[PDB]
Coordinates of all heavy atoms in Angstrom, one line a residue:
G1 N 6.5 -6.6 32.0 CA 7.0 -5.3 32.2 C 6.5 -4.8 33.6 O 5.9 -5.5 34.4
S2 N 6.8 -3.5 33.8 CA 6.4 -2.8 35.0 C 6.5 -1.3 34.8 O 7.0 -0.9 33.7 CB 7.3 -3.2 36.2 OG 7.6 -4.5 36.2
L3 N 6.0 -0.5 35.7 CA 5.9 1.0 35.5 C 7.3 1.5 35.1 O 8.1 2.0 36.0 CB 5.2 1.6 36.7 CG 5.7 1.5 38.1 CD1 5.5 2.7 38.9 CD2 5.0 0.3 38.8
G4 N 7.5 1.4 33.9 CA 8.8 1.8 33.2 C 9.2 0.6 32.3 O 9.0 0.7 31.1
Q5 N 9.6 -0.4 32.9 CA 10.1 -1.6 32.5 C 9.9 -2.2 31.1 O 10.6 -3.2 30.7 CB 9.7 -2.8 33.5 CG 10.9 -3.6 34.0 CD 10.6 -5.1 34.2 OE1 9.9 -5.7 33.4 NE2 11.2 -5.7 35.2
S6 N 8.9 -1.7 30.4 CA 8.7 -2.0 29.0 C 8.4 -3.5 28.7 O 8.4 -4.4 29.6 CB 9.9 -1.6 28.1 OG 10.1 -0.2 28.3
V7 N 8.1 -3.7 27.5 CA 7.8 -5.0 26.8 C 7.9 -4.8 25.3 O 7.5 -3.8 24.7 CB 6.6 -5.6 27.4 CG1 5.3 -4.8 27.1 CG2 6.4 -7.0 26.8
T8 N 8.3 -5.9 24.7 CA 8.4 -6.0 23.2 C 7.8 -7.4 22.9 O 8.1 -8.4 23.6 CB 9.9 -5.9 22.8 OG1 10.4 -4.6 23.4 CG2 10.1 -5.9 21.3
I9 N 7.1 -7.4 21.8 CA 6.3 -8.6 21.4 C 6.8 -9.2 20.1 O 7.5 -8.6 19.3 CB 4.8 -8.3 21.4 CG1 4.5 -7.7 22.8 CG2 3.9 -9.4 21.1 CD1 3.0 -7.5 23.2
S10 N 6.4 -10.5 19.9 CA 6.7 -11.3 18.7 C 5.5 -11.2 17.7 O 4.3 -11.1 18.1 CB 7.0 -12.7 19.0 OG 6.7 -13.5 17.8
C11 N 5.8 -11.3 16.5 CA 4.9 -11.5 15.3 C 5.8 -12.1 14.3 O 6.6 -11.4 13.6 CB 4.1 -10.3 15.0 SG 3.1 -10.1 13.6
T12 N 5.9 -13.4 14.3 CA 6.8 -14.2 13.5 C 6.0 -14.9 12.4 O 5.2 -15.8 12.7 CB 7.7 -15.0 14.4 OG1 8.4 -14.1 15.3 CG2 8.8 -15.9 13.7
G13 N 6.3 -14.6 11.2 CA 5.7 -15.1 10.0 C 6.7 -15.6 9.0 O 7.8 -16.0 9.4
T14 N 6.4 -15.5 7.7 CA 7.3 -15.9 6.6 C 7.4 -14.9 5.5 O 6.8 -13.8 5.6 CB 7.0 -17.3 6.1 OG1 5.8 -17.3 5.3 CG2 6.9 -18.4 7.2
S15 N 8.3 -15.1 4.6 CA 8.6 -14.1 3.5 C 7.4 -14.0 2.5 O 7.3 -13.1 1.7 CB 9.9 -14.3 2.8 OG 10.4 -15.6 2.8
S16 N 6.4 -14.9 2.7 CA 5.1 -14.9 2.0 C 4.2 -13.8 2.7 O 3.2 -13.4 2.0 CB 4.5 -16.2 2.0 OG 3.9 -16.7 3.2
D17 N 4.5 -13.4 3.9 CA 3.6 -12.5 4.7 C 4.4 -12.0 5.9 O 5.0 -12.8 6.7 CB 2.3 -13.3 5.0 CG 2.6 -14.8 5.2 OD1 3.5 -15.2 6.0 OD2 1.8 -15.5 4.6
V18 N 4.4 -10.7 6.1 CA 5.3 -10.0 7.0 C 6.7 -9.8 6.4 O 7.1 -8.7 6.2 CB 5.3 -10.5 8.4 CG1 6.6 -10.2 9.1 CG2 4.2 -9.9 9.2
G19 N 7.3 -10.9 6.0 CA 8.7 -10.9 5.5 C 8.7 -10.4 4.0 O 9.8 -10.3 3.4
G20 N 7.5 -10.1 3.6 CA 7.3 -9.7 2.1 C 6.9 -8.3 2.0 O 7.8 -7.4 1.8
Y21 N 5.6 -8.0 2.2 CA 5.1 -6.7 2.1 C 5.3 -6.0 3.4 O 5.7 -6.6 4.4 CB 3.6 -6.7 1.7 CG 3.1 -7.9 0.9 CD1 3.2 -9.2 1.4 CD2 2.5 -7.7 -0.3 CE1 2.8 -10.3 0.7 CE2 2.1 -8.8 -1.1 CZ 2.2 -10.1 -0.6 OH 1.8 -11.2 -1.3
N22 N 4.9 -4.7 3.5 CA 5.1 -3.9 4.7 C 3.9 -3.3 5.3 O 3.7 -2.0 5.3 CB 6.3 -3.0 4.6 CG 7.6 -3.6 5.3 OD1 8.3 -2.9 6.0 ND2 7.8 -4.9 5.1
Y23 N 3.1 -4.1 5.9 CA 1.8 -3.8 6.5 C 1.6 -4.6 7.8 O 0.9 -5.6 7.9 CB 0.6 -4.2 5.6 CG 0.8 -3.7 4.2 CD1 1.3 -4.4 3.1 CD2 0.5 -2.3 3.9 CE1 1.5 -3.9 1.8 CE2 0.7 -1.8 2.7 CZ 1.1 -2.5 1.6 OH 1.3 -1.9 0.4
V24 N 2.4 -4.1 8.8 CA 2.4 -4.8 10.1 C 1.4 -4.0 11.0 O 1.6 -2.8 11.2 CB 3.7 -5.0 10.7 CG1 3.7 -5.5 12.2 CG2 4.6 -5.9 9.9
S25 N 0.3 -4.8 11.3 CA -0.7 -4.0 12.1 C -1.0 -4.7 13.4 O -1.0 -6.0 13.4 CB -1.9 -3.7 11.2 OG -1.4 -3.1 10.0
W26 N -1.3 -3.9 14.4 CA -1.5 -4.4 15.8 C -2.8 -3.9 16.4 O -3.1 -2.7 16.5 CB -0.4 -4.0 16.7 CG 1.0 -4.6 16.4 CD1 2.0 -3.9 15.7 CD2 1.6 -5.8 16.9 NE1 3.1 -4.7 15.7 CE2 2.9 -5.8 16.4 CE3 1.1 -6.8 17.7 CZ2 3.7 -6.9 16.7 CZ3 2.0 -7.9 17.9 CH2 3.3 -7.9 17.4
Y27 N -3.6 -4.9 16.8 CA -4.9 -4.7 17.4 C -4.9 -4.9 18.9 O -4.5 -5.9 19.4 CB -5.9 -5.7 16.7 CG -5.8 -5.6 15.2 CD1 -5.3 -6.7 14.5 CD2 -6.4 -4.6 14.5 CE1 -5.3 -6.7 13.1 CE2 -6.3 -4.5 13.1 CZ -5.8 -5.6 12.4 OH -5.8 -5.6 11.0
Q28 N -5.4 -3.8 19.6 CA -5.3 -3.9 21.1 C -6.7 -4.3 21.6 O -7.5 -3.5 22.1 CB -4.8 -2.7 21.8 CG -4.6 -3.1 23.3 CD -4.1 -1.9 24.1 OE1 -4.3 -1.9 25.4 NE2 -3.3 -1.0 23.6
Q29 N -6.9 -5.6 21.6 CA -8.0 -6.3 22.2 C -8.1 -6.3 23.7 O -7.6 -7.3 24.3 CB -8.0 -7.8 21.7 CG -9.2 -8.6 22.0 CD -10.5 -7.9 21.5 OE1 -11.1 -7.1 22.2 NE2 -10.9 -8.3 20.3
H30 N -8.7 -5.3 24.2 CA -9.0 -5.3 25.7 C -10.1 -6.3 26.0 O -11.2 -6.4 25.3 CB -9.5 -3.9 26.3 CG -8.4 -3.0 26.7 ND1 -7.4 -3.3 27.6 CD2 -8.2 -1.7 26.3 CE1 -6.6 -2.2 27.7 NE2 -7.1 -1.2 27.0
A31 N -9.8 -7.2 26.9 CA -10.6 -8.3 27.4 C -12.1 -8.2 27.2 O -12.9 -7.8 28.1 CB -10.4 -8.4 29.0
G32 N -12.5 -8.7 26.0 CA -13.9 -8.7 25.5 C -14.3 -7.3 25.0 O -15.1 -6.6 25.5
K33 N -13.6 -6.9 23.9 CA -13.8 -5.6 23.3 C -13.6 -5.6 21.8 O -13.2 -6.6 21.2 CB -12.9 -4.5 23.9 CG -13.5 -3.7 25.0 CD -13.3 -4.4 26.4 CE -13.7 -3.4 27.5 NZ -13.2 -3.9 28.8
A34 N -14.0 -4.5 21.1 CA -13.6 -4.2 19.7 C -12.2 -3.7 19.7 O -11.8 -2.8 20.4 CB -14.6 -3.2 19.2
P35 N -11.4 -4.2 18.7 CA -10.0 -4.0 18.6 C -9.2 -2.8 18.7 O -8.0 -3.0 19.2 CB -9.7 -4.6 17.2 CG -10.5 -5.9 17.3 CD -11.8 -5.4 17.9
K36 N -9.5 -1.6 18.4 CA -8.6 -0.4 18.5 C -7.2 -0.7 18.0 O -6.3 -1.1 18.7 CB -8.6 0.2 19.9 CG -7.4 1.0 20.3 CD -7.3 2.3 19.6 CE -6.5 3.4 20.3 NZ -6.4 4.6 19.6
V37 N -7.0 -0.5 16.7 CA -5.7 -0.7 16.0 C -4.9 0.4 16.6 O -5.4 1.6 16.7 CB -5.8 -0.7 14.5 CG1 -7.1 -1.4 14.0 CG2 -5.7 0.7 13.9
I38 N -3.6 0.1 16.9 CA -2.7 1.2 17.4 C -1.6 1.4 16.4 O -0.9 2.5 16.5 CB -2.3 0.8 18.8 CG1 -1.8 -0.6 19.0 CG2 -3.4 1.2 19.8 CD1 -1.5 -1.1 20.5
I39 N -1.4 0.6 15.4 CA -0.3 0.7 14.4 C -0.6 -0.1 13.1 O -0.9 -1.3 13.2 CB 1.0 0.4 15.0 CG1 1.9 1.7 15.1 CG2 1.8 -0.8 14.3 CD1 3.1 1.6 16.0

């Protein structure tokens, strides 16, 4: 992306997980840090 330009990411699993329950969580790992979940 770029200042505006956006980005969208993958998280591709199966109906056993992700495709099943609804608990999609994202961890923002800054280069050698503790995670900070954003969602």
